């Protein structure tokens, strides 16, 4: 890979973006910042993964650097992002993955240390938002701070694009049945801002608010105000599913929907939007790099204008690979 | 607390209908048939329950009878339902809970042994179907074989009744996020007729078919052909949730929906349809006897005619208590 | 008449000690300190519990106080325990349940605010340690700061006392198969001090170190240096089990072990050490208030001097009730 | 010159023995019998696996045969094993994996249809039993029906061999914390012979009896009568762990035990007995083909003669690979 990348935060998104970068070879990770995880612990956290298995390659600590597949990575331990010397480490792009510096003002602190561009691996209240395969062609070299939206927006937007382009979405309501995440608790504990999210993750189906369907309206401006939804967190370690109930303007028989989604999966959205007619379940998408995989057998139509469409997503690996693809696309435009 | 009842099958539904009968005191269990579970094992299965806790009372085997709280229950071990001597044991109504004698022809075999009425604790292809609080007033003494529909139909129908009575449901699509059931497998195993249902229940979100939303059109005839849906089985031991996405005829602001559902929960549907504004999760409904509990905070409206309504249900205890309530209602009409 | 109690920390132990105090009525909770959980959130966390169900009585926020069953409780939000005004609230005993002030020096900070005695609801490196039914008669009025040991020590010590008193333990090695706890992570995350404990709790069996078996040697001085062990954390929300493999001095047939444990459970250790011959599983002990329940059917003897003994414990409810029992015992000695 | 194999049963062991056979290339599967799983369903069950992921080769149904990586496999659907035409399909060795024909009389039914040898992939009450790396050199050409013991015996026997050879095991007691299996139930259900095994697998820690430690005494005659144990089934989909508490004749410092086990893992037991000092958890052994992996950091010594040794095993893939290794060894002796 050609662009040199720095990763802020070695949490689940930071580690899996690093794993995707080395597995795909599309970008070169040269620096990682994390003030709470030391070098020897980073080796362990990167090498072993309960969900995705052992890293396929070599990882070791050598001379104060994390060396992955022979590539040395400078390690920083700064709490203040404006103090990270990204430029001295050669990091041109920075993936801001901590989840706490998501505004352009906060993510822009990485420019002080010499980074040229910042990619927020989460929704942002004000940064331009992108979804690969949907609006990445709207990216240009003047944008120094951008967001790759969320894993759920990356699942819904490619499907919504195909459905809207062929039949027109009059309105839609989404539910995502989502795997557990790092912000949840093992047993009933404090969450403060989101009380239901503090309840034991192993024991419960937990309703949760999500701006993912509304965010599709920013990535596909014609759907602004036409979509909203919510989520249920369930006790699975990984892989989630979107359930889009929509009204269509043009009549669409279910076989016509299958035809256009299959055609999009084989052409312009290949590798982004998948298509299957197999009797799949969530574990079949573990470590799958697609953003969205349409499940033809799981959906149901009430009539030609009112349908429920189902799409699977590995909420960890699909999204992490899209962060890398977005950076590779950005690098090709330099 | 008067009608004498026989229970065919000591599976999950049979045992919890028996527990609901002794806890509510509305009906008297006098006989149980199960050809595969012997008396000493019935004591154990009834006394200890992983989901609902130990039985609060006494359970013993004495002189070939199952004795619960000092009440002796005759135990039969017949494979052929037409050979069960219900009349001789004093059982007036029989709960057909095995899941394999759901047609009126098959469930009618209990009349040969002297039962007066049969309540199929499952959907039936041809028996009259009832949901307490929705169409139980249509029951008449002439009906000897009836069905109490499924746990999911009992959750959706009370909510759909209130919404349709106040705003009119033009069309709706339902998703149920359902707890695991006895027909699922611990690890990937054979299912044959439903391939996805054989996949490991602890590891997967599994899409599944349900006739529950279509069945609401039989208990609420005005909704015939206007509702359908599907399910996702998730790894929780009990408690499920319905997500109804519907198009309304009259405009309904979300606060107007909350007001009419709250009013119904405090009046004609008290004890059947619940209402909450608390930050609840699924475990909060464990052993809850309501058929449906509207979650005001979890639902979302796109506009005044297109909304997503959420309702919780203890798929084991709500349904089992409704079987007892249906029999008590039937007894009051004799 | 009842001692007035303050609880420092409204985490899992703090809330369940508060619940055990109201359920048993043995002590009066008058104050709670927690700098991270505000009053409205305390109402929610106390009222709903995924593991133990909804609180039986009433819970509400009124005039800045937490009102449980009509009893108002003063709420403090201090990070420094020496600044908590326990005396202004009338709190005589303080339960130090945060897990971070476990030395006599740190727990003693509560005496500055007017508390008379402090009970550390966790192991302490230097405070006198007690296990109800084993050494609580060694408590005296001169001890202002004491520890109630851990949930695991309270399970092992009553059983080890009976076995050692009757047959003599030459040596023993313990394994506890433990339910998940609040210190674990939902998905692979940072733990720093204990790397295995950061691994996803829902996906893994995790080995862990524990000083519980060694601590039994401090509560039963004759067993000092004769016991040690380790733990496996497994994905269950609650209820744990001890597996004690010990070498006995006097020969003990397995029926002789059952006889002495049953006799102890019916006499001096009634309510502390339970005994069962039923085919129990972990969920059968959910919300069980015993410290230890000997499982006669699960254990196995290789010979008369080498046996494996099994004992269940609700790691949340047994221990929380023992904290209340220890305070009631202390109050009776004033 | 590879042996042609028939597999009776396409359950968990049958499918993973087939997968190990194609992955290792040590034998050629030419036939599979299963009366309950038809050809199209076998394609699906083999292709998708919740635990071990998708089969990365090719699988399809063609002309009534199951074709894996271009190799056609004859499919039989016989309930009676004496009616399976193994000889017509060219199957020389038959893996009897149903768990229902484990005596030499029942497993010998495969000789009627033309098989030359039968390998029971489970313990047998009377067939000669083997563990690769421990007693496979005792196999000879006169043995037509043999057993590969259980996954647990294959974990304990290699470790017990090394410990006994170097220090002498005076006596030992084993506990296995075992992942869930196909014989368990998703929710509390019937298991007439083993009541605890019917209890909900997702909710419980379930004690269970196992003859695995006693079976080590048949494979290592010098340990006959010196070992026994029990199991706890816990809610993990795969990977189990053995906890051997043993008294040693020669003094053994824990570092001496580590040295001896590490040396065995690098020499005569390479690929059978693993050794690690890493901070591993169960998911780190998912799809690991070792029979046993000694966890140096998890074990604990009370003194030089009384220790607790921990060893991990992928109860599905380690055992399935040993069945293939045993057949490859048998074939080399023809």
PDB file of N, CA and C in Angstrom, chain C residues 232-304:
ATOM      1  N   UNK C 232     -12.203 -20.297  36.751  1.00  0.00           N
ATOM      2  CA  UNK C 232     -12.528 -20.218  35.335  1.00  0.00           C
ATOM      3  C   UNK C 232     -13.779 -19.344  35.266  1.00  0.00           C
ATOM      4  N   UNK C 233     -13.730 -18.230  34.546  1.00  0.00           N
ATOM      5  CA  UNK C 233     -14.907 -17.387  34.365  1.00  0.00           C
ATOM      6  C   UNK C 233     -15.610 -17.950  33.129  1.00  0.00           C
ATOM      7  N   UNK C 234     -16.913 -18.165  33.208  1.00  0.00           N
ATOM      8  CA  UNK C 234     -17.674 -18.735  32.108  1.00  0.00           C
ATOM      9  C   UNK C 234     -18.879 -17.855  31.805  1.00  0.00           C
ATOM     10  N   UNK C 235     -19.440 -17.922  30.578  1.00  0.00           N
ATOM     11  CA  UNK C 235     -20.523 -16.995  30.234  1.00  0.00           C
ATOM     12  C   UNK C 235     -21.919 -17.314  30.770  1.00  0.00           C
ATOM     13  N   UNK C 236     -22.074 -17.155  32.081  1.00  0.00           N
ATOM     14  CA  UNK C 236     -23.366 -17.188  32.766  1.00  0.00           C
ATOM     15  C   UNK C 236     -23.417 -15.893  33.549  1.00  0.00           C
ATOM     16  N   UNK C 237     -24.596 -15.293  33.656  1.00  0.00           N
ATOM     17  CA  UNK C 237     -24.746 -14.009  34.328  1.00  0.00           C
ATOM     18  C   UNK C 237     -24.616 -14.069  35.840  1.00  0.00           C
ATOM     19  N   UNK C 238     -24.940 -15.216  36.437  1.00  0.00           N
ATOM     20  CA  UNK C 238     -24.875 -15.361  37.885  1.00  0.00           C
ATOM     21  C   UNK C 238     -24.901 -16.814  38.290  1.00  0.00           C
ATOM     22  N   UNK C 239     -24.424 -17.079  39.529  1.00  0.00           N
ATOM     23  CA  UNK C 239     -24.320 -18.382  40.178  1.00  0.00           C
ATOM     24  C   UNK C 239     -23.002 -19.033  39.774  1.00  0.00           C
ATOM     25  N   UNK C 240     -22.252 -19.452  40.773  1.00  0.00           N
ATOM     26  CA  UNK C 240     -20.945 -20.034  40.603  1.00  0.00           C
ATOM     27  C   UNK C 240     -20.878 -21.350  41.387  1.00  0.00           C
ATOM     28  N   UNK C 241     -19.799 -22.111  41.177  1.00  0.00           N
ATOM     29  CA  UNK C 241     -19.659 -23.394  41.848  1.00  0.00           C
ATOM     30  C   UNK C 241     -18.220 -23.623  42.220  1.00  0.00           C
ATOM     31  N   UNK C 242     -18.005 -24.170  43.415  1.00  0.00           N
ATOM     32  CA  UNK C 242     -16.695 -24.505  43.945  1.00  0.00           C
ATOM     33  C   UNK C 242     -16.535 -26.020  43.773  1.00  0.00           C
ATOM     34  N   UNK C 243     -15.325 -26.415  43.435  1.00  0.00           N
ATOM     35  CA  UNK C 243     -14.919 -27.784  43.235  1.00  0.00           C
ATOM     36  C   UNK C 243     -13.651 -27.941  44.091  1.00  0.00           C
ATOM     37  N   UNK C 244     -13.798 -28.538  45.278  1.00  0.00           N
ATOM     38  CA  UNK C 244     -12.700 -28.724  46.214  1.00  0.00           C
ATOM     39  C   UNK C 244     -12.165 -30.156  46.127  1.00  0.00           C
ATOM     40  N   UNK C 245     -10.921 -30.314  45.666  1.00  0.00           N
ATOM     41  CA  UNK C 245     -10.291 -31.628  45.593  1.00  0.00           C
ATOM     42  C   UNK C 245      -9.385 -31.688  46.796  1.00  0.00           C
ATOM     43  N   UNK C 246      -9.689 -32.563  47.761  1.00  0.00           N
ATOM     44  CA  UNK C 246      -8.888 -32.612  48.981  1.00  0.00           C
ATOM     45  C   UNK C 246      -8.501 -34.016  49.400  1.00  0.00           C
ATOM     46  N   UNK C 247      -7.390 -34.073  50.136  1.00  0.00           N
ATOM     47  CA  UNK C 247      -6.827 -35.251  50.750  1.00  0.00           C
ATOM     48  C   UNK C 247      -7.232 -35.201  52.220  1.00  0.00           C
ATOM     49  N   UNK C 248      -7.892 -36.264  52.721  1.00  0.00           N
ATOM     50  CA  UNK C 248      -8.386 -36.326  54.097  1.00  0.00           C
ATOM     51  C   UNK C 248      -7.472 -37.176  54.978  1.00  0.00           C
ATOM     52  N   UNK C 249      -7.348 -36.828  56.263  1.00  0.00           N
ATOM     53  CA  UNK C 249      -6.510 -37.577  57.185  1.00  0.00           C
ATOM     54  C   UNK C 249      -7.237 -38.844  57.621  1.00  0.00           C
ATOM     55  N   UNK C 250      -8.478 -38.721  58.099  1.00  0.00           N
ATOM     56  CA  UNK C 250      -9.259 -39.899  58.474  1.00  0.00           C
ATOM     57  C   UNK C 250      -9.997 -40.412  57.250  1.00  0.00           C
ATOM     58  N   UNK C 251     -10.200 -41.739  57.130  1.00  0.00           N
ATOM     59  CA  UNK C 251     -10.953 -42.246  55.978  1.00  0.00           C
ATOM     60  C   UNK C 251     -12.392 -41.775  56.028  1.00  0.00           C
ATOM     61  N   UNK C 252     -12.925 -41.391  54.879  1.00  0.00           N
ATOM     62  CA  UNK C 252     -14.282 -40.904  54.800  1.00  0.00           C
ATOM     63  C   UNK C 252     -14.935 -41.487  53.590  1.00  0.00           C
ATOM     64  N   UNK C 253     -15.911 -42.375  53.789  1.00  0.00           N
ATOM     65  CA  UNK C 253     -16.700 -42.885  52.672  1.00  0.00           C
ATOM     66  C   UNK C 253     -17.593 -41.721  52.222  1.00  0.00           C
ATOM     67  N   UNK C 254     -17.950 -41.671  50.944  1.00  0.00           N
ATOM     68  CA  UNK C 254     -18.752 -40.559  50.437  1.00  0.00           C
ATOM     69  C   UNK C 254     -20.093 -40.398  51.198  1.00  0.00           C
ATOM     70  N   UNK C 255     -20.737 -41.520  51.613  1.00  0.00           N
ATOM     71  CA  UNK C 255     -21.960 -41.438  52.420  1.00  0.00           C
ATOM     72  C   UNK C 255     -21.708 -40.814  53.810  1.00  0.00           C
ATOM     73  N   UNK C 256     -20.511 -40.979  54.380  1.00  0.00           N
ATOM     74  CA  UNK C 256     -20.161 -40.364  55.668  1.00  0.00           C
ATOM     75  C   UNK C 256     -20.009 -38.852  55.480  1.00  0.00           C
ATOM     76  N   UNK C 257     -19.437 -38.410  54.342  1.00  0.00           N
ATOM     77  CA  UNK C 257     -19.292 -36.979  54.038  1.00  0.00           C
ATOM     78  C   UNK C 257     -20.688 -36.371  53.901  1.00  0.00           C
ATOM     79  N   UNK C 258     -21.582 -37.039  53.162  1.00  0.00           N
ATOM     80  CA  UNK C 258     -22.956 -36.566  52.993  1.00  0.00           C
ATOM     81  C   UNK C 258     -23.665 -36.426  54.341  1.00  0.00           C
ATOM     82  N   UNK C 259     -23.490 -37.421  55.229  1.00  0.00           N
ATOM     83  CA  UNK C 259     -24.119 -37.407  56.546  1.00  0.00           C
ATOM     84  C   UNK C 259     -23.683 -36.199  57.385  1.00  0.00           C
ATOM     85  N   UNK C 260     -22.375 -35.932  57.496  1.00  0.00           N
ATOM     86  CA  UNK C 260     -21.899 -34.818  58.323  1.00  0.00           C
ATOM     87  C   UNK C 260     -22.258 -33.463  57.718  1.00  0.00           C
ATOM     88  N   UNK C 261     -22.251 -33.335  56.377  1.00  0.00           N
ATOM     89  CA  UNK C 261     -22.618 -32.061  55.757  1.00  0.00           C
ATOM     90  C   UNK C 261     -24.117 -31.823  55.955  1.00  0.00           C
ATOM     91  N   UNK C 262     -24.954 -32.862  55.762  1.00  0.00           N
ATOM     92  CA  UNK C 262     -26.396 -32.730  55.972  1.00  0.00           C
ATOM     93  C   UNK C 262     -26.700 -32.321  57.424  1.00  0.00           C
ATOM     94  N   UNK C 263     -26.049 -32.965  58.403  1.00  0.00           N
ATOM     95  CA  UNK C 263     -26.247 -32.619  59.813  1.00  0.00           C
ATOM     96  C   UNK C 263     -25.847 -31.163  60.106  1.00  0.00           C
ATOM     97  N   UNK C 264     -24.742 -30.700  59.524  1.00  0.00           N
ATOM     98  CA  UNK C 264     -24.287 -29.332  59.726  1.00  0.00           C
ATOM     99  C   UNK C 264     -25.285 -28.344  59.100  1.00  0.00           C
ATOM    100  N   UNK C 265     -25.836 -28.666  57.929  1.00  0.00           N
ATOM    101  CA  UNK C 265     -26.814 -27.805  57.250  1.00  0.00           C
ATOM    102  C   UNK C 265     -28.136 -27.678  58.041  1.00  0.00           C
ATOM    103  N   UNK C 266     -28.474 -28.690  58.849  1.00  0.00           N
ATOM    104  CA  UNK C 266     -29.690 -28.697  59.668  1.00  0.00           C
ATOM    105  C   UNK C 266     -29.481 -28.106  61.077  1.00  0.00           C
ATOM    106  N   UNK C 267     -28.235 -27.907  61.501  1.00  0.00           N
ATOM    107  CA  UNK C 267     -27.947 -27.368  62.816  1.00  0.00           C
ATOM    108  C   UNK C 267     -27.208 -26.048  62.831  1.00  0.00           C
ATOM    109  N   UNK C 268     -25.928 -26.037  63.246  1.00  0.00           N
ATOM    110  CA  UNK C 268     -25.236 -24.748  63.438  1.00  0.00           C
ATOM    111  C   UNK C 268     -25.053 -23.876  62.195  1.00  0.00           C
ATOM    112  N   UNK C 269     -25.035 -24.462  61.009  1.00  0.00           N
ATOM    113  CA  UNK C 269     -24.851 -23.715  59.762  1.00  0.00           C
ATOM    114  C   UNK C 269     -26.142 -23.574  58.960  1.00  0.00           C
ATOM    115  N   UNK C 270     -27.325 -23.766  59.577  1.00  0.00           N
ATOM    116  CA  UNK C 270     -28.608 -23.622  58.880  1.00  0.00           C
ATOM    117  C   UNK C 270     -28.737 -22.217  58.261  1.00  0.00           C
ATOM    118  N   UNK C 271     -29.089 -22.150  56.974  1.00  0.00           N
ATOM    119  CA  UNK C 271     -29.176 -20.887  56.249  1.00  0.00           C
ATOM    120  C   UNK C 271     -27.854 -20.416  55.653  1.00  0.00           C
ATOM    121  N   UNK C 272     -26.709 -20.994  56.098  1.00  0.00           N
ATOM    122  CA  UNK C 272     -25.365 -20.662  55.606  1.00  0.00           C
ATOM    123  C   UNK C 272     -24.915 -21.788  54.655  1.00  0.00           C
ATOM    124  N   UNK C 273     -24.900 -23.030  55.142  1.00  0.00           N
ATOM    125  CA  UNK C 273     -24.502 -24.178  54.356  1.00  0.00           C
ATOM    126  C   UNK C 273     -25.753 -24.987  54.076  1.00  0.00           C
ATOM    127  N   UNK C 274     -26.065 -25.136  52.799  1.00  0.00           N
ATOM    128  CA  UNK C 274     -27.188 -25.928  52.338  1.00  0.00           C
ATOM    129  C   UNK C 274     -26.727 -27.313  51.951  1.00  0.00           C
ATOM    130  N   UNK C 275     -27.679 -28.196  51.716  1.00  0.00           N
ATOM    131  CA  UNK C 275     -27.380 -29.567  51.322  1.00  0.00           C
ATOM    132  C   UNK C 275     -28.471 -30.038  50.383  1.00  0.00           C
ATOM    133  N   UNK C 276     -28.104 -30.651  49.261  1.00  0.00           N
ATOM    134  CA  UNK C 276     -29.099 -31.190  48.349  1.00  0.00           C
ATOM    135  C   UNK C 276     -28.615 -32.465  47.723  1.00  0.00           C
ATOM    136  N   UNK C 277     -29.563 -33.362  47.466  1.00  0.00           N
ATOM    137  CA  UNK C 277     -29.378 -34.596  46.702  1.00  0.00           C
ATOM    138  C   UNK C 277     -30.167 -34.501  45.357  1.00  0.00           C
ATOM    139  N   UNK C 278     -30.828 -33.357  45.062  1.00  0.00           N
ATOM    140  CA  UNK C 278     -31.573 -33.159  43.823  1.00  0.00           C
ATOM    141  C   UNK C 278     -30.639 -32.920  42.631  1.00  0.00           C
ATOM    142  N   UNK C 279     -31.148 -33.162  41.418  1.00  0.00           N
ATOM    143  CA  UNK C 279     -30.391 -33.036  40.168  1.00  0.00           C
ATOM    144  C   UNK C 279     -30.325 -31.569  39.741  1.00  0.00           C
ATOM    145  N   UNK C 280     -29.730 -30.754  40.594  1.00  0.00           N
ATOM    146  CA  UNK C 280     -29.680 -29.314  40.392  1.00  0.00           C
ATOM    147  C   UNK C 280     -28.682 -28.848  39.329  1.00  0.00           C
ATOM    148  N   UNK C 281     -28.938 -27.652  38.810  1.00  0.00           N
ATOM    149  CA  UNK C 281     -28.050 -26.947  37.883  1.00  0.00           C
ATOM    150  C   UNK C 281     -27.940 -25.507  38.427  1.00  0.00           C
ATOM    151  N   UNK C 282     -27.030 -24.698  37.884  1.00  0.00           N
ATOM    152  CA  UNK C 282     -26.776 -23.375  38.447  1.00  0.00           C
ATOM    153  C   UNK C 282     -27.998 -22.468  38.609  1.00  0.00           C
ATOM    154  N   UNK C 283     -28.900 -22.397  37.611  1.00  0.00           N
ATOM    155  CA  UNK C 283     -30.069 -21.511  37.721  1.00  0.00           C
ATOM    156  C   UNK C 283     -30.967 -21.868  38.912  1.00  0.00           C
ATOM    157  N   UNK C 284     -30.893 -23.107  39.446  1.00  0.00           N
ATOM    158  CA  UNK C 284     -31.679 -23.476  40.624  1.00  0.00           C
ATOM    159  C   UNK C 284     -31.253 -22.702  41.882  1.00  0.00           C
ATOM    160  N   UNK C 285     -30.065 -22.082  41.880  1.00  0.00           N
ATOM    161  CA  UNK C 285     -29.585 -21.281  42.996  1.00  0.00           C
ATOM    162  C   UNK C 285     -29.698 -19.787  42.734  1.00  0.00           C
ATOM    163  N   UNK C 286     -30.423 -19.358  41.662  1.00  0.00           N
ATOM    164  CA  UNK C 286     -30.570 -17.937  41.414  1.00  0.00           C
ATOM    165  C   UNK C 286     -31.426 -17.325  42.515  1.00  0.00           C
ATOM    166  N   UNK C 287     -30.881 -16.296  43.157  1.00  0.00           N
ATOM    167  CA  UNK C 287     -31.475 -15.607  44.297  1.00  0.00           C
ATOM    168  C   UNK C 287     -31.532 -16.472  45.558  1.00  0.00           C
ATOM    169  N   UNK C 288     -30.713 -17.529  45.642  1.00  0.00           N
ATOM    170  CA  UNK C 288     -30.664 -18.371  46.834  1.00  0.00           C
ATOM    171  C   UNK C 288     -29.743 -17.643  47.822  1.00  0.00           C
ATOM    172  N   UNK C 289     -30.160 -17.512  49.084  1.00  0.00           N
ATOM    173  CA  UNK C 289     -29.387 -16.752  50.066  1.00  0.00           C
ATOM    174  C   UNK C 289     -28.356 -17.563  50.845  1.00  0.00           C
ATOM    175  N   UNK C 290     -28.164 -18.866  50.556  1.00  0.00           N
ATOM    176  CA  UNK C 290     -27.121 -19.637  51.241  1.00  0.00           C
ATOM    177  C   UNK C 290     -25.742 -19.166  50.780  1.00  0.00           C
ATOM    178  N   UNK C 291     -24.745 -19.330  51.633  1.00  0.00           N
ATOM    179  CA  UNK C 291     -23.352 -19.044  51.268  1.00  0.00           C
ATOM    180  C   UNK C 291     -22.782 -20.176  50.405  1.00  0.00           C
ATOM    181  N   UNK C 292     -23.218 -21.409  50.666  1.00  0.00           N
ATOM    182  CA  UNK C 292     -22.679 -22.612  50.070  1.00  0.00           C
ATOM    183  C   UNK C 292     -23.768 -23.684  50.066  1.00  0.00           C
ATOM    184  N   UNK C 293     -23.984 -24.419  48.972  1.00  0.00           N
ATOM    185  CA  UNK C 293     -24.943 -25.531  48.986  1.00  0.00           C
ATOM    186  C   UNK C 293     -24.243 -26.753  48.434  1.00  0.00           C
ATOM    187  N   UNK C 294     -23.977 -27.720  49.308  1.00  0.00           N
ATOM    188  CA  UNK C 294     -23.300 -28.949  48.943  1.00  0.00           C
ATOM    189  C   UNK C 294     -24.165 -29.757  47.987  1.00  0.00           C
ATOM    190  N   UNK C 295     -23.593 -30.155  46.839  1.00  0.00           N
ATOM    191  CA  UNK C 295     -24.290 -30.941  45.822  1.00  0.00           C
ATOM    192  C   UNK C 295     -23.827 -32.390  45.997  1.00  0.00           C
ATOM    193  N   UNK C 296     -24.621 -33.198  46.704  1.00  0.00           N
ATOM    194  CA  UNK C 296     -24.234 -34.578  46.991  1.00  0.00           C
ATOM    195  C   UNK C 296     -24.045 -35.425  45.737  1.00  0.00           C
ATOM    196  N   UNK C 297     -24.933 -35.295  44.762  1.00  0.00           N
ATOM    197  CA  UNK C 297     -24.825 -36.067  43.530  1.00  0.00           C
ATOM    198  C   UNK C 297     -23.689 -35.698  42.589  1.00  0.00           C
ATOM    199  N   UNK C 298     -23.185 -34.455  42.640  1.00  0.00           N
ATOM    200  CA  UNK C 298     -22.149 -34.008  41.703  1.00  0.00           C
ATOM    201  C   UNK C 298     -20.727 -34.390  42.078  1.00  0.00           C
ATOM    202  N   UNK C 299     -20.458 -34.579  43.364  1.00  0.00           N
ATOM    203  CA  UNK C 299     -19.110 -34.907  43.808  1.00  0.00           C
ATOM    204  C   UNK C 299     -18.719 -36.331  43.513  1.00  0.00           C
ATOM    205  N   UNK C 300     -17.430 -36.623  43.642  1.00  0.00           N
ATOM    206  CA  UNK C 300     -16.929 -37.962  43.354  1.00  0.00           C
ATOM    207  C   UNK C 300     -15.715 -38.257  44.198  1.00  0.00           C
ATOM    208  N   UNK C 301     -15.627 -39.495  44.676  1.00  0.00           N
ATOM    209  CA  UNK C 301     -14.507 -39.938  45.478  1.00  0.00           C
ATOM    210  C   UNK C 301     -13.656 -40.889  44.658  1.00  0.00           C
ATOM    211  N   UNK C 302     -12.327 -40.720  44.694  1.00  0.00           N
ATOM    212  CA  UNK C 302     -11.442 -41.709  44.078  1.00  0.00           C
ATOM    213  C   UNK C 302     -11.261 -42.843  45.111  1.00  0.00           C
ATOM    214  N   UNK C 303     -11.026 -42.480  46.382  1.00  0.00           N
ATOM    215  CA  UNK C 303     -10.875 -43.426  47.484  1.00  0.00           C
ATOM    216  C   UNK C 303     -11.294 -42.733  48.805  1.00  0.00           C
ATOM    217  N   UNK C 304     -11.171 -43.410  49.953  1.00  0.00           N
ATOM    218  CA  UNK C 304     -11.579 -42.839  51.240  1.00  0.00           C
ATOM    219  C   UNK C 304     -10.777 -41.632  51.696  1.00  0.00           C
TER     220      UNK C 304
END
